[PDB]
Each structure stands twice: as C-alpha cells, then as structure tokens.
Amino acid sequence: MMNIIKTLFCSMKMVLLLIGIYATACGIATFIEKYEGTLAARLWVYDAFWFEILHIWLVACLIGCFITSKAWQRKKYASLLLHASFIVIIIGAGITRYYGFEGLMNLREGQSVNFISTNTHYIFIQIKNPQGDVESVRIPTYIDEKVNHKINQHLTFFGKPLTLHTEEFTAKQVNMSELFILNASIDFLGKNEKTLIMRDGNNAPTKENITMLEIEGYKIFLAWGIDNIALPFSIKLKKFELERYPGSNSPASYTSEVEVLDGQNPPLPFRIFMNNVLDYGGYRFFQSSYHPDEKGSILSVNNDPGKTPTYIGYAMLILGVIWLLFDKNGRFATLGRFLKTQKLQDIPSMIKALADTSSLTNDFDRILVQDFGGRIKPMHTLANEYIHKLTQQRTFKGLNPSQVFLGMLFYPQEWQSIQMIATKSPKLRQILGLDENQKHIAYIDVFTPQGQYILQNYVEAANLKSPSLRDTFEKDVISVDERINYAFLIYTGQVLRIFPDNKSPNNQWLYPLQAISSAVAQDDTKKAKELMQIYKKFAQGMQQGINTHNWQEAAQATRDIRTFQQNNGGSLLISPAKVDSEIWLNLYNPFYQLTYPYIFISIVLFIIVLVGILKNTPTRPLIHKVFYILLFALFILHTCGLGLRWYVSEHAPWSNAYESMLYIAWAAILSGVVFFRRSNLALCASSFLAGMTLFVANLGDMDPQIGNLMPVLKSYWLNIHVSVITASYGFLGLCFMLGLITLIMFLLRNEKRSQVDCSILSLSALNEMSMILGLFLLSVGNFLGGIWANESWGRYWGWDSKETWALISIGVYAIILHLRFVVPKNFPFIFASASVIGFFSVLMTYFGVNYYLPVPLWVELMVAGIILLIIIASRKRVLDMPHLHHHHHH
Ligand SMILES: CCCCCCCCCCCCCCCCCCCC(=O)O[C@H](COC(=O)CCCCCCCCCCCCCC)COP(=O)(O)OCCN
Numbered sequence: 001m002m003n004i005i006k007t008l009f010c011s012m013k014m015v016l017l018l019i020g021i022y023a024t025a026c027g028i029a030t031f032i033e034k035y036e037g038t039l040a041a042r043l044w045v046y047d048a049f050w051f052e053i054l055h056i057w058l059v060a061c062l063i064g065c066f067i068t069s070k071a072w073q074r075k076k077y078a079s080l081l082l083h084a085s086f087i088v089i090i091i092g093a094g095i096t097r098y099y100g101f102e103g104l105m106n107l108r109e110g111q112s113v114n115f116i117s118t119n120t121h122y123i124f125i126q127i128k129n130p131q132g133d134v135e136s137v138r139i140p141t142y143i144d145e146k147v148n149h150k151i152n153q154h155l156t157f158f159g160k161p162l163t164l165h166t167e168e169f170t171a172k173q174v175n176m177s178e179l180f181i182l183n184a185s186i187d188f189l190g191k192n193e194k195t196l197i198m199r200d201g202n203n204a205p206t207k208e209n210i211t212m213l214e215i216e217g218y219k220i221f222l223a224w225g226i227d228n229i230a231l232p233f234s235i236k237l238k239k240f241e242l243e244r245y246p247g248s249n250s251p252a253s254y255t256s257e258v259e260v261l262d263g264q265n266p267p268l269p270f271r272i273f274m275n276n277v278l279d280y281g282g283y284r285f286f287q288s289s290y291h292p293d294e295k296g297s298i299l300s301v302n303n304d305p306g307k308t309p310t311y312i313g314y315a316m317l318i319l320g321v322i323w324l325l326f327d328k329n330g331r332f333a334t335l336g337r338f339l340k341t342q343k344l345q346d347i348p349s350m351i352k353a354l355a356d357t358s359s360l361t362n363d364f365d366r367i368l369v370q371d372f373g374g375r376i377k378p379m380h381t382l383a384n385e386y387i388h389k390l391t392q393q394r395t396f397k398g399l400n401p402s403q404v405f406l407g408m409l410f411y412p413q414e415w416q417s418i419q420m421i422a423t424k425s426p427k428l429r430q431i432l433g434l435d436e437n438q439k440h441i442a443y444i445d446v447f448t449p450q451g452q453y454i455l456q457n458y459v460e461a462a463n464l465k466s467p468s469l470r471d472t473f474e475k476d477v478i479s480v481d482e483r484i485n486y487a488f489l490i491y492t493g494q495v496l497r498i499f500p501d502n503k504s505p506n507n508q509w510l511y512p513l514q515a516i517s518s519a520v521a522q523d524d525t526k527k528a529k530e531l532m533q534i535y536k537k538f539a540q541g542m543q544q545g546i547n548t549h550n551w552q553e554a555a556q557a558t559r560d561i562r563t564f565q566q567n568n569g570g571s572l573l574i575s576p577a578k579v580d581s582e583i584w585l586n587l588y589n590p591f592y593q594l595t596y597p598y599i600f601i602s603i604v605l606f607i608i609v610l611v612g613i614l615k616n617t618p619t620r621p622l623i624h625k626v627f628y629i630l631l632f633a634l635f636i637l638h639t640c641g642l643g644l645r646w647y648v649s650e651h652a653p654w655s656n657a658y659e660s661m662l663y664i665a666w667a668a669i670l671s672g673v674v675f676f677r678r679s680n681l682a683l684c685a686s687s688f689l690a691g692m693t694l695f696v697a698n699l700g701d702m703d704p705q706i707g708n709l710m711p712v713l714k715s716y717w718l719n720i721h722v723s724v725i726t727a728s729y730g731f732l733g734l735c736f737m738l739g740l741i742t743l744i745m746f747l748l749r750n751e752k753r754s755q756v757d758c759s760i761l762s763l764s765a766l767n768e769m770s771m772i773l774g775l776f777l778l779s780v781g782n783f784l785g786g787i788w789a790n791e792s793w794g795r796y797w798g799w800d801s802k803e804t805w806a807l808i809s810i811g812v813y814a815i816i817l818h819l820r821f822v823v824p825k826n827f828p829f830i831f832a833s834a835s836v837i838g839f840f841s842v843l844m845t846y847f848g849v850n851y852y853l854p855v856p857l858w859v860e861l862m863v864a865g866i867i868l869l870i871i872i873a874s875r876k877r878v879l880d881m882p883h884l885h886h887h888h889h890h
C-alpha cells in the first residue's frame, strides 16, 4: 500500500532531487568527456548502472506522485497524457538498450556477404572442459587506450568457476604488425597464471589463436576485439561508382546500386544514393564510407525495435502539449484569466562600370539555360543561385547577381583575386594562411605558386569519413571544395549551358566553347560561323564596354543569342511571358523583407504593454487598434504575395521545404489576426512565431541552395527543428528579462505604493506563462533532433555535446515549474530568482559548449551582479499569490 511508499517519501520533494541528480550527472559527463577525450566518459556515466536504476526510480516516483495527488480522481486528462508519454519514452529507451544491435557491413564486388562487424569491442574466453566441450563467454570490457579497467567477471560451470583479472595496456604496435599487447592474469583451482592478450587489428580476430593454456579443464582461449553477427539474407554490389568534380579530380557523390537475395526468394535490386537508405528487414543500412580501392563500400547498420514505441511517445507528447495549452483549468489558461481579471584590367571602378547599366541584364535575364541537374531555368535564377552559394551574402559589394556573373565571366582574372568564397572555420583558413577574422577567401589563395591545389589532400582524406557525425572542420573542407569547383565552372564558360545539341529535345545543351569545337565543327551545323561570330561579338563588346560604357553591342548580341535559342529549341522553350513572370516574382517576392517586421512589431508592442502593467493601468485601446491594423496590412501583403507565389509557381503548397514553412508562418499570423482581436500579447506571440519561422525558412534557401548532384540540408525535420529551438530560446530570454525586472521591482516596494505589489503578481504570472511556452517548445524541439538523426544520418539520440545540455535546460526548467508544489509561500520572489538563474543553462547550450567542446570573467561580471541583486532584494520578499482581487489588490 502507498503508506510505505510515503515513508519512502516519493513526492515532489524527491522528484526534484532525482531530476537534479540526473542533470548534474549528464552535465559532469561533458567535462569528463573533454578531459578524458574518449568513450571513458560513457564508461563512467552514460552506460553505467547509475541511470539503469535511476530511470526506474524516476518512473515509479512519477506514478506515485500522480497517485498521491489523486490526479485521476480529478479529470485533468491532458496533463496525464503528458506524463503518460515520458513513461513511454523512457521505457522505449530501456528496450533500446538491450536490443540495439550495431555494426558495419563491408560490401565488396561479388562477395555475397552475410556478416555485420560490430564496432562494440569485446574480449573472448573459452575453455574446453575436460569433456572437450565448448563453454564460452563474451565480455564487453570496452577499454581502448585512455582507460584500462580491472575486469571482474568470473563465470563458468563445467567445474570450479573461472576468475579473471586485467593489468595493463603494454602495447608495442609497429604498423607492420598490430601489436596491441596487454597483460592479464587468470585463476583456476590451484592453477592461476599470467597471460598476454595482444589484440589484433580492428578488422577481425584471427591471429589471437594463442591458446595460452592446455590442461583439460584448464585449456584456454583468449581474444580481444570485434565480433560478427549473421543476417538471414545475403547482400552484394552491382557496381560501385564515385564521380569527381572536373576541376579538382575530387570526389562528388557515392553510389552503390546493390542487390539483395536469398536461397529461394529471387534477388531484389536496390539503389542507394549517398543520402538514401536500404530497409528490407528490421535492419536499416546507411552508406557511410568507401574503400580507397573503389571496389567496395561500407554500410552503417542498426536495428532497434524500440523505435515505434518511442515514436508513439513523441506523438503522445505533441498531442498533450497542444491540448494542455488550451484546456481550461490548465495553469496557462488560468494565469491568462488572472491577467484578464487585473486588466590591363584593373579592379577599381569596375564595380561601377558593371553596376550603373542594367540594360543588358534586363534581357540577359531572359535567356534560357540548363542547370545540368536536368532542369531548364531562366538565367536570372541560375546566376542568383550560383552567386548565392559562392557568396552567402544576398548581395555582394554591389552587382545584383547577374551583374557579378557577367563580370566574373568576361573580366575573370580580376574577380580571381577578389575574396568571393565564404569560409566558416578559422582552422581551414589556417592552411591557406591570412588567419585573421576573415569571412572570405580569394580563388588565387587555394593554389601554391605552383599549380598545386593545396586543399586537395585534406578533402580527399576527409570525404572518406565526412558523411557521419564529424567535426565542423570535416564539413567546411568539403563545402569549400564544392564552392571552389563551382567558381571554376563559372570561369572558362562551363556554366553558360546555352546551345542545344540537337533540334529534337535530346537535351544536353552544350557549353559555348566545346559547342563550336565539337557539335558545331564536327557536324555540318552551318550555324557555326553565325554562332562563332555571335559569341566573339559578345566578348568583344563586353571587353570594350568597361572602357566606353555605351556597350549596347552586347545587348544586340544577347538578342541574337535569344533568337537563336528561340528558333533552335523545341517544346522545352518556355514562353517569354512565363519567363518574364518568373523573374518578376523573383524580384518582387516579399519573404526576404518580411523577416524583420514580424519581430520588430511584436517587440515594440510587448514593451509598451510591459510599461502599461508596470503601472497597473491598462493601455488605451487606441494602440491595440493601431498595431492590429499594422498586422492586418502585413498579413494582407503576405497572403497576396503567397497567393501570387502559388499562381506563378506550380509548387503545390505541399511544396518544397522553403514554401512549406512560409505556409506555416502564414497559418501562425492568421491564428494571430483571426482569433485574437482581443489581447495584444496574442499578436506579439503570433507575430514572433511567424517571424522566426519565416526567417529560418528563408535562411534555409540561402546556404542550402542547390548546385548540381549534391544533396543539401532541406529536410523538413531539420528546418522545423531549428525554427522551434530558436523560438524557444527567444521565449526563454524573454523569461529571463521579466524575472530580472521582478527582482528589480522588489527593491522599489516601500509600503507607500502597494500598486507595485499587484504589478509584481502580474509580472510573475506573465513570466510563468512565457516559461511554460518555452519549456514545451524546447521539449518538442529537442526530440525532433532525435527524430531527424534517426531518419537521416544514423542510429538515434545519442549522448552528444550540446544535446545533453539541451536536456539539462529541459530538466532545470522542469524543476522550476513544478517547484510550485514544494515551496510553500513567497512564490513570486522565489520564482523570479530561479527564472533568472536557470537562464545559464540556455546560455551554456548556446555559447559555452562552443568553448568547452579558462576564466572569461565577463560571466563573473554578469553573475556577480545577478547575485548581489538577489541578495539585496531578498530583504523585502514577503508576498503571496491569491487569485481573487482588484485595484489595491491584484
Ligand atoms: C515491442 C517490444 C516489447 C518488448 C517487451 C516489453 C518491454 C520490456 C521493456 C524492458 C525495459 C528494461 C529497461 C528499462 C529501464 C531502462 C532505463 C534506461 C533507458 C536508456 O537509457 O535508454 C537509452 C536510449 O537513449 C535515450 O535517448 C533515452 C531517452 C532520453 C532519456 C531521458 C528521457 C527523455 C527526456 C525526458 C526525461 C525526463 C525529463 C527530465 C530529465 C540507452 O542508450 P543508447 O541510446 O546509447 O542505447 C544504445 C547502447 N548501445
């Protein structure tokens, strides 16, 4: 009966302590991860028995706390669903612990492989009992080099049980032989002995057949290394392939094209692009690496039956959050009701010579060109995309993208010294030099004084391992290699994919040069000279134009080009009206500009409402009318622009990732405008959500902008995830601000102006509401990351830097909220203190981890002020939170 459990003291008082213990453990894990720099941290905490008991303790106490609170006598269903989920989540992780297979699969031509090779290391012990039997055991013993654990496993049953010990990693490798030597001792009745292990290479234990001991009942077999597991079906390669970028002989994309077969089930072919996955059984396969002989490829493999229950838990959690945010008698709506109750050829001047014309651009935008992905495009968009992926700036020093495109084409050697290419990490620039706080590099910078492309070796080594989770640097090298190859393609004309190779579609659409040299010269063509003199006139007029500025000869040349394409292309020839309309859209669309107002308006309305409640009198409805009218105007403009988007582009609002989040922002601002011509803060929140979603979506088309043949980060899950996390941190910052304001106000009250106490209560309520929103959004967000990882790059959630700390933020804010039930009185001041203090978890997750993947006394200057403020303000902390009052009272 529960009376004993009450003497176990399972109640909020203890649930808080368990959550705090879990948080501090998952935190300290980060520091030991750094200092040990290895899996040793997982040895101490993540996989230790600590959690394997603490999670059960937690679940049981949750159950007990709901029982003692009689949560099911009251109806309260939405909150039940919420804590119902976490139980499902944790039990799912639990099952994932025991049944989570893992390993690597070595696919090779004509091999017909059956074995997974595990990355989990193991030691092996076997004894041929005098009965010549096979008693065997496998012990994990996951040491590598930074940790050398004393084994304590002593099991066998043919006779007097085995006992074993490990001493020291006395390895002597020379890389001609992989001598991972290690010394150990073994015990048997009257026959204890000392031994050497010498683990073999990570490929497979075969040489470790040492056979250290022989006597029947004493014969022994020891090994240390990887084990293998057999699938129920065979796999083989059809033909591996690895394309190169032409300008660097560097790898572009992997392709497997494998086959699956069984002894009676006929073979099934299957295809795997570098981002694709195979699923035939419970197993799932991720292509992750290729052997440098380029005749075999490695697949990452996982099986985890815990997936479906955990997904059910995620769905339950989403539904619970959405339901609780509106269910009356929920704390959020109840605080809302409380609030409502109380209320040659040099660079300089070439930029000008390009910019101040626009005449050619007005028509060269109108040419039709291929992306060589397979899609025709109007020039403006292709050049926009190329310039945007080279320079992440929406615009350069000048030169609307088409202008810089022409410039790089026909004044190349100058732009070759311009710092176009963007680079993130300073480590990469450390190879190229000039390691200031630079944002860009020049194309010349990547070459030796000789013709050597210097980054080639770094990238060639990195791409072989980059597809998995990796250091930033391992991503930056390949991104910059891609951008460099694209700039090479922009040079020497290999992007001006104008001329069709045949009158019938048969579309390849050749370059300028090899068009003349090949198809044009090879085939009769006749249009040879025409095309020759057309392109030559183009080049001549352009190279003259920088001098004369009345270069319209290139404009007539462009008319010639367009007429040629018009009378040489087939049905692929888009109508001129549609081309004009597409460019017209790409210029006029609002979604770039609209990022700022949705934020600014929300903040400016929020601050004035804050000034209102700080003096406890309500704001005149005049401002409500004004700002609702402004939101209405922005909404009308946005809706019409989005409708025009749908009208011009057939992208079917179940569209590309970019437009989908535009529709989500539309929905958010709509919810704002339609249902809430009642309360200003609803406009604030709705506009802020729409603004954040819009900004993240627009950014999602800037950096991930496609070039050719490479995939990008357009996955719906990742975009939603980033947007949610950003909004959550915004809400949490607002919480921090409000709490700090409460702490300051506590200084002011002197019993002469009791109104400030009603203001205190109002602010505490608003802060708690905003923190509830923050916590719910952060909860959903953090798990969307685990969803994304599971379906994109690999296994699942995994104890990882910044992930544990997002979990710590969740944990701390959970502590803060339920806290209500523990602390008996003076809730306002307590809550203000905690709301300010807990912000450091978000600050960690956002900035600090990037330092701690030291004494920056800036943080000391911050925390000392916070501490002294709390100190002094505590002197007058006596207030309470009733829910029925007016005027002098709340
Ligand atoms: C259909 C099949 C039916 C089978 C039969 C019925 C079911 C029997 C079930 C038996 C279950 C026995 C075990 C129960 C206790 C296990 C508790 C620990 C579970 C756990 O740690 O899971 C981790 C998963 O990661 C995680 O992500 C854990 C989730 C996150 C942990 C915290 C929970 C979510 C956040 C909210 C917590 C509370 C908020 C405040 C903190 C494992 O680790 P791993 O993934 O590395 O495993 C791969 C290792 N090779």
Ligand code: HEB
Pocket: 012, 015, 019, 058, 061, 062, 065, 066, 069, 071, 076, 079, 082, 083, 086, 324, 330, 331, 775, 776, 779, 814, 818
């Ligand atoms: C998501 C996040 C979160 C988390 C993590 C949590 C976690 C928790 N939690 Fe929670 N909760 C929550 C969120 C939360 N939570 C909310 C939102 C609520 C609602 C409030 C009210 O309604 O009151 C609650 C509520 C609640 C309550 C109250 C209800 C009644 O009626 O009584 C309790 C007791 C609890 C406990 C708890 C515990 C023990 C734990 C550990 C696991 N919670």
